From Swiss-Prot:
Residues of the full protein shown: 2473 to 2581 of 3117
Protein name: Centrosome-associated protein 350
UniProt PTM: Phosphorylated during mitosis.
Annotated tissue distribution: Detected in heart, brain, skeletal muscle, testis, placenta, lung, liver, kidney and pancreas.
Function: Plays an essential role in centriole growth by stabilizing a procentriolar seed composed of at least, SASS6 and CPAP. Required for anchoring microtubules to the centrosomes and for the integrity of the microtubule network. Recruits PPARA to discrete subcellular compartments and thereby modulates PPARA activity. Required for ciliation.
Cellular location(s): Cytoplasm, Cytoskeleton, Microtubule organizing center, Centrosome; Cytoplasm, Cytoskeleton, Spindle; Nucleus; Cytoplasm, Cytoskeleton, Microtubule organizing center, Centrosome, Centriole
Species the sequence originates in: Homo sapiens
């Protein structure tokens, strides 16, 4: 122990601290940002709503929002809210299955629109 201080001594002797002062810098979806289109497994198109470590499972989990009802989640995984979407549109897929949708893959885009208000008089 630190034998040579005295005066000011706190109460910190817990027997559990895997990481507190130093935390390993580990990232996978650093290039991907929230609010962008992504292709799950290069087949299932959608939008990146979430991306990071979850509670139900370990590892990076990106909550892509499929334009069509193909997913099996609504943003909330076992109660844990991550993003907003239909009942079965949002799907959590690993980072490895996260790629940018080809520019030639959007004949018509006009979905996702819940936030709509007009407080002020425009």
């Amino acid at each position: 122990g630190s034998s040579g201080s005295s005066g000011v001594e706190h109460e910190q002797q817990v027997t559990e601290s895997p990481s507190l002062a130093s935390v390993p810098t580990a990232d996978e979806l650093f290039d991907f940002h929230i609010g962008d289109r992504v292709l799950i497994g290069n087949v299932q198109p959608g939008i990146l709503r979430f991306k990071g470590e979850t509670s139900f499972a370990k590892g990076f989990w990106a909550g892509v929002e499929l334009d069509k009802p193909e997913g099996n989640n609504n943003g909330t995984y076992d109660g844990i809210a991550y993003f907003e979407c239909k009942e079965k549109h949002g799907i959590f897929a690993p980072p490895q299955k996260i790629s940018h949708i080809p520019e030639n893959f959007d004949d018509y885009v006009d979905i996702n629109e819940d936030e709509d208000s007009g407080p002020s008089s425009g």
